[PDB]
Structure 1
Amino acid sequence: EFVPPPECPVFEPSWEEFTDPLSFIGRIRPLAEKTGICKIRPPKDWQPPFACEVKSFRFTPRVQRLNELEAMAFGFEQAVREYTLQSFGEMADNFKSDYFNMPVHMVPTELVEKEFWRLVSSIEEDVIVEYGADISSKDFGSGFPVKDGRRKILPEEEEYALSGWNLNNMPVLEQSVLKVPWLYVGMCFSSFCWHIEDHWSYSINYLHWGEPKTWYGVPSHAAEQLEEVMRELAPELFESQPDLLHQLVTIMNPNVLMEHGVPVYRTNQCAGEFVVTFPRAYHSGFNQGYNFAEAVNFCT
């Protein structure tokens, strides 16, 4: 069965260290850049409200067939449904509780992880899920409060609208001679395959609420090694594809990378926790259940 990779670093900054995100990320860099990803738990009393327009939040998630690569009237597999945040959560909880035959919060994270990777390589069982991925924060607002006048800000919420850890306040303009956060409404087994960011950018990721998001990360010093293992084992039909396109279907069991000498670290990002990916740190993951994440690429 699946062997969980070693855990990535988790930092619990004090209020003093939590003052400046870029300063903190710069200070943890000697360790975190050697693991590719890391997790940051804010101080206990740092609890931003959820600021999306929930009444009007509507979206059509994308269908994900977990074993599509292994499986190589097709094209009309599933029927698309539009959801609200509530109706998607109802669907997501019903799927998970039916699949595991237990209440959603009782399913061990290790079991969802083991079952996810079994399903990815299974030819005898076709599991299909839906992912509300890459919803722009312009559509229904950011999950963080933003002082743009579109939604009321309470006095006790203003500090979060001005916080440097508010993803809308991360720097995004790269220096050159010559960008807003994105939202992810997850369900059990919804996933993102191995990739790096455009321009080898850092990314920061915040789980607003819900069940955890499970991550895998590879340090940048092993980026070429991972790409080598990909070219060896990825389908021949997608081998010659440019990286930007190949990254749409670069799903690979972490144990396969580990067996080929590639260092891989994991974490369960829980509600209220940040995940930072360092430059050229390949990462991939899946959601344990119904959750809501916000992410943005930033520069230092």
Structure 2
Amino acid sequence: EFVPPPECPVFEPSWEEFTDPLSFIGRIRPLAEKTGICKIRPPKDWQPPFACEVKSFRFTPRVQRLNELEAMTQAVREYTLQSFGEMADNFKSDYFNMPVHMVPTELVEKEFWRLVSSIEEDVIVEYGADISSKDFGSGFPVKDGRRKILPEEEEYALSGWNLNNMPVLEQSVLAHINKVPWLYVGMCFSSFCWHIEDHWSYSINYLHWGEPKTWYGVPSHAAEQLEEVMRELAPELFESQPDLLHQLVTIMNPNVLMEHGVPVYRTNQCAGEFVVTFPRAYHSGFNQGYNFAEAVNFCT
């Protein structure tokens, strides 16, 4: 069965270290760049409110067939946050015959990877992925006037760890001659396959609420090693595809990469925790259950 990769670094900055995100990320870089991904737990008393327009939040999530690649050899339906959560919890509790909170993270992980390569069982899930923060607002409070902000929430609207306040403009000559966070509503086994960011950007990811998001990361020094294993083992029909298209179907069990000598690290990102991905650090992951994440690419 699946062997969990080693854990990536977790940082628990003090209030002093927590003052500036770019400064803190710059300081942890000698360790974190060697693991590709890292997790950051804010101080216990840092608790932003959840600020999306819940009454009107509606979406049609994409359908994900876990074993679609293995198989080489359902209409979109609309939910609210509440109705998606009812569906997601019923799915997971039915699947494991247990209350959702009682399912060990290790068992979801082992079952996910078994299903990805199974030919006898076809499991299909749904992912509310790539929902713009413009549609119903960010999960963080923002001082744009669309939604009321209480006085005790203003510090979160102004915080450098609010994803809407991260720097996003890349330096370039074209910038002289001449982006908002995205949201992800997860359910058990919804997933994202191996990729890096456009422009080799950093990314930062915050889990507002719900069950954990499980991540795998590869440090940038091993990016070419990973791409070589993909070439060798990915289906030939997709082998000639440009990376921007191949990344839509680059699903690969971390143990396969590990057997080929690619360093892989894992983490369970829990509610209230951040994950940072370093430049050119391949990453992939899946959701343990019903949850809500926000992510943005930022530059240093």
Q: Deviations over 1:85-107 (max 9, x none)?
A: 00000000000000000000000
- What SS is found at the alignment partner of 1:25? helix
Q: What is the CA-CA distance between 1:170 and the residue it aligns to? A: 0.2
CA distance in 1: counterparts of 2:62 and 2:143, whole angstroms: 31
CA distance in 1: counterparts of 2:184 and 2:91, whole angstroms: 18
- What SS is found at the alignment partner of 1:296? strand
CA distance in 2: counterparts of 1:249 and 1:158, whole angstroms: 41
Q: What is the CA-CA distance between 1:172 and the residue it aligns to? A: 0.1
- What SS is found at the alignment partner of 1:214? strand
Q: Deviations over 1:199-250 (max 9, x none)?
A: 0000000000000000000000000000000000000000000000000000
Q: Deviations over 1:177-208 (max 9, x none)?
A: 00000000000000000000000000000000
TM-score by length of 2: 0.98
CA distance in 1: counterparts of 2:75 and 2:146, whole angstroms: 34
CA distance in 1: counterparts of 2:135 and 2:258, whole angstroms: 39
Q: Deviations over 1:73-118 (max 9, x none)?
A: xxxxx13210000000000000000000000000000000000000
Aligned pairs for 1:166-181 within 5 A: 166-178=162-174, 179-181=179-181
Q: What is the CA-CA distance between 1:136 and the residue it aligns to? A: 0.2
CA distance in 2: counterparts of 1:140 and 1:191, whole angstroms: 23
CA distance in 2: counterparts of 1:157 and 1:87, whole angstroms: 28
- What SS is found at the alignment partner of 2:71? coil
Which residue of structure 2 lines up, in the alignment, with residue 241 of structure 1? 241
**Do residues 53 (structure 1) and 53 (structure 2) align?**
yes
CA distance in 1: counterparts of 2:273 and 2:220, whole angstroms: 23
CA distance in 2: counterparts of 1:11 and 1:106, whole angstroms: 27
Q: What is the CA-CA distance between 1:30 and the residue it aligns to? A: 0.1
CA distance in 2: counterparts of 1:153 and 1:173, whole angstroms: 27
Unaligned runs of 5+ in 1: 73-77
- What SS is found at the alignment partner of 2:113? helix
Flag as ranges the 4+ runs of structure 1 deviating above 2 A: none
Which residue of structure 1 lines up, in the alignment, with residue 36 of structure 2? 36
Report sequence identity in percent.
100
Pairwise CA RMSD = 0.3
Q: Deviations over 1:23-80 (max 9, x none)?
A: 00000000000000000000000000000000000000000000000000xxxxx132
Q: What is the CA-CA distance between 1:283 and the residue it aligns to? A: 0.1
CA distance in 1: counterparts of 2:181 and 2:197, whole angstroms: 14
Q: Deviations over 1:264-300 (max 9, x none)?
A: 0000000000000000000000000000000000000
- What SS is found at the alignment partner of 1:147? coil
CA distance in 1: counterparts of 2:75 and 2:220, whole angstroms: 39
